[PDB]
Amino acid sequence: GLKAAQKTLFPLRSIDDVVRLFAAELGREEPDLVLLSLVLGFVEHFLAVNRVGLTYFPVADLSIIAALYARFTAQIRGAVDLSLYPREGGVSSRELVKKVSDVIWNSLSRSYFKDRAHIQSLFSFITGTKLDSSGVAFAVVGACQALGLRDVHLALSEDHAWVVFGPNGEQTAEVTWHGKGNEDRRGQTVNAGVAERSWLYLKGSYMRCDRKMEVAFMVCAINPSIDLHTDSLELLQLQQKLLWLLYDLGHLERYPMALGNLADLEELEPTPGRPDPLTLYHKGIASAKTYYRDEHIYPYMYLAGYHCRNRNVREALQAWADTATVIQDYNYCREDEEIYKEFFEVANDVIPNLLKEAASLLEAGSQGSALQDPECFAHLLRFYDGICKWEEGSPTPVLHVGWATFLVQSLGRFEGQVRQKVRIVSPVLTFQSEKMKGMKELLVATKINSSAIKLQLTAQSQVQMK
Numbered sequence: 001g002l003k004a005a006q007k008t009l010f011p012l013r014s015i016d017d018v019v020r021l022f023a024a025e026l027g028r029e030e031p032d033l034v035l036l037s038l039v040l041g042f043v044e045h046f047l048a049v050n051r052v053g054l055t056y057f058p059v060a061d062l063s064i065i066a067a068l069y070a071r072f073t074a075q076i077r078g079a080v081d082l083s084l085y086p087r088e089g090g091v092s093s094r095e096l097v098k099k100v101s102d103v104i105w106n107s108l109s110r111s112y113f114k115d116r117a118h119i120q121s122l123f124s125f126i127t128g129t130k131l132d133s134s135g136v137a138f139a140v141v142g143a144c145q146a147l148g149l150r151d152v153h154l155a156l157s158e159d160h161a162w163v164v165f166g167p168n169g170e171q172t173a174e175v176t177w178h179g180k181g182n183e184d185r186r187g188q189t190v191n192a193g194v195a196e197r198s199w200l201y202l203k204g205s206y207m208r209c210d211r212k213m214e215v216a217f218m219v220c221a222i223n224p225s226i227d228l229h230t231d232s233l234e235l236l237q238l239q240q241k242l243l244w245l246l247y248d249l250g251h252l253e254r255y256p257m258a259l260g261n262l263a264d265l266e267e268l269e270p271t272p273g274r275p276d277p278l279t280l281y282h283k284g285i286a287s288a289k290t291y292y293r294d295e296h297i298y299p300y301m302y303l304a305g306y307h308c309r310n311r312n313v314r315e316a317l318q319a320w321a322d323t324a325t326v327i328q329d330y331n332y333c334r335e336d337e338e339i340y341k342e343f344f345e346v347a348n349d350v351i352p353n354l355l356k357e358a359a360s361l362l363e364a365g366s367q368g369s370a371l372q373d374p375e376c377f378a379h380l381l382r383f384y385d386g387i388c389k390w391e392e393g394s395p396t397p398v399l400h401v402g403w404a405t406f407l408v409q410s411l412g413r414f415e416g417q418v419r420q421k422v423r424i425v426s427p428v429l430t431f432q433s434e435k436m437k438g439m440k441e442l443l444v445a446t447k448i449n450s451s452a453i454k455l456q457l458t459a460q461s462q463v464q465m466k
């Protein structure tokens with residue numbers, strides 16, 4: 001190592017002192033990822049993992065943080081001999097990146113629950129020898145920075161992390177595992193995944209972080225959970241203040257998920273004088289459209305979730321339709337299961353429950369109901385259209401009869417006089433999927449033909465013999 005200037009703010013005695021540290025680091029040529037991660041993990045440990053003795057804020061003394069830092073840098077410098085990996089052109093080699101990844105990996109406890117909370121930071125790595133998947137990638141990036149490898153950066157998709165490095169930052173390397181029971185590809189590029197148009201690699205529209213975005217990632221990674229029922233107010237406040245710092249400095253401009261997480265935080269506890277959650281969700285979407293070819297799914301899911309929680313049925317349906325309009329241009333591949341789960345839950349749990357409540361409120365005389373609005377019926381149909389188009393050309397199917405039952409139920413929540421108002425052109429809607437085009441017929445009958453809908457959604461050839 002730490003430079004004299006990095007040590008002057010210690011000891012950190014409050015949330016605001018932590019913020020000052022982040023501000024100072026973000027004003028340097030290269031914010032110190034190892035320092036920042038250790039500090040966050042320290043404070044998260046004593047605010048969420050073990051609050052015994054807590055009276056206000058766990059004071060971070062320089063002696064403690066410097067000793068942690070020293071343990072990290074000694075482990076990396078000792079295990080990674082740079083002389084073995086000459087740096088042609090001031091850039092790193094694939095062998096070097098693999099070596100660092102191996103060092104982190106080989107350091108981890110043989111057996112532990114990999115999706116436990118509070119195993120994301122370098123504090124967990126040093127004190128517990130435990131990291132979660134994306135924590136391994138971050139730690140490889142922190143280790144490379146500590147070694148002076150200015151070219152190695154964190155790459156992020158909506159469900160995975162890896163690194164970029166090399167000439168022009170153009171190389172990619174896997175450095176961690178993905179999911180559960182997948183075969184790891186550490187050391188390889190991500191080009192096969194990009195080529196197959198999976199959600200996992202976002203068709204190449206994944207995030208290539210700079211150092212400041214790496215800081216935003218560790219701040220997003222703060223986990224305020226104490227247990228299932230309780231969050232640390234202190235950590236929520238810290239994460240929120242740090243996200244605003246990053247926002248003000250321009251460092252969330254290319255980070256849609258961070259803007260969504262900040263909006264979620266503001267919904268819980270708004271900061272006076274700041275943009276509304278809805279504004280922030282829309283900025284997240286704008287970020288995805290501007291920097292990532294509008295190929296991200298979660299910016300629309302964050303917005304829909306807000307509208308959902310506020311029982312704005314119309315706007316939630318619109319946002320979910322827009323989510324499906326993104327997914328339609330992907331191929332559903334092995335390893336995309338997390339997004340399938342999200343779409344399944346929306347279709348088969350969240351929407352049904354929203355519409356059930358809407359039906360009850362309609363019975364009690366509501367006005368302007370989504371169930372009387374043909375634009376809302378159109379959004380529902382557009383959501384299913386994108387899911388069907390997603391399925392087209394995919395190596396694994398998406399729909400099955402489990403989805404058909406909920407589709408029939410959801411359609412039926414709208415009276416025929418409402419459904420009849422949507423014009424399906426080859427409120428107006430154009431279908432992209434062949435499944436929904438063949439369904440058009442069935443979508444306006446007063447009584448929905450349940451069996452025909454099921455046949456059309458699942459492309460089941462036949463009915464019961466006997």
Ligand SMILES: CC1(C)CN=C(N2CCN(c3ncnc4sc(CC(F)F)cc34)CC2)S1
Binds near residue numbers: 134257298302305
């Ligand atoms: C609309 C949702 C279902 C609500 N929370 C969502 N999240 C999406 C994942 N979150 C994230 N937030 C900031 N950065 C990242 S990077 C990353 C991938 C990982 F492998 F590095 C995930 C993620 C935050 C939680 S999506």
